[PDB]
Design a protein around this ligand. Structure first.
Ligand code: SAH
Length: 212
């Protein structure tokens, strides 16, 4: 049974990285128990990490004024919102928490330049990663902060990933590669994307997180 839930999780997990966000959204809409499975599995993984990226991100944000408006892109169970006093917009494909605004984070119900900080904490799952980051750019005020955490094994070439993100109107401010389980990148918004919506951007193609 325990071995089965993990097999199930590992299959679903691999599936979630393999398709566009529309696929993941449909799956969770039609099969909400799959969402429960995913998070049972995800929690079993992050429990064994000395420090979760949400907590590291919360620590960062607690050092800045709590008036900064945060968007948590792929918020899961909203530990970020629970950990900071900021206004935190919580977006995910399905809801484990009453603060969740259910949507594809490629298209969130916020105005342009409405947020100070966009967070992607282990959430850049679908193949259409460009969509997520462009939506982050849209909602971010000029000079706003983008924080990205992903498992390090997802990055076969950090250099090109960072280069591609820069093409979407961001500047790297710092990167923390010191945690053994994830890389954390802080970018600041310089403006709108500087490659048109028909440019290629291969640097964004990440490897799936396979949890060991
Ligand atoms: N396109 C999308 N739109 C909204 N949420 C998405 C999404 N793609 C992935 N997610 C969400 O991203 C989450 C990844 S697990 C990480 C959850 C949370 N940030 C934490 O650190 O605890 C899942 O809840 C998943 O449903």
């Amino acid at each position: 049974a325990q071995r089965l839930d993990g097999a199930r999780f590992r299959y679903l997990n691999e599936q979630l990285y393999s398709g566009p966000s529309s696929a993941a959204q449909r799956l969770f809409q039609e099969d909400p128990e799959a969402f429960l499975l995913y998070h049972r599995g995800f929690q079993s993984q992050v429990k064994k990490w000395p420090l979760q990226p949400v907590d590291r991100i919360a620590r960062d944000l607690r050092q800045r004024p709590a008036s900064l408006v945060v968007a948590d892109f792929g918020c899961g169970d909203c530990r970020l919102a629970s950990s900071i006093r900021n206004p935190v917009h919580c977006f995910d494909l399905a809801s484990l928490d009453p603060r969740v605004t259910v949507c594809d984070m490629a298209q969130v119900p916020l105005e342009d330049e409405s947020v100070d900080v966009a967070v992607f904490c282990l959430s850049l799952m679908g193949t259409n990663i460009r969509d997520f980051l462009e939506e982050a750019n849209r909602v971010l005020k000029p000079g706003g902060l983008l924080k990205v955490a992903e498992v390090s094994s997802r990055f076969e070439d950090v250099r090109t990933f960072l280069r591609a993100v820069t093409k979407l109107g961001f500047k790297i401010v710092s990167k923390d590669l010191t945690n053994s389980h994830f890389f954390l990148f802080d970018f600041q918004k310089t403006g709108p994307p500087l490659v048109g919506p028909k440019a290629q951007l291969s640097g964004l193609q990440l490897q799936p997180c396979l949890y060991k």
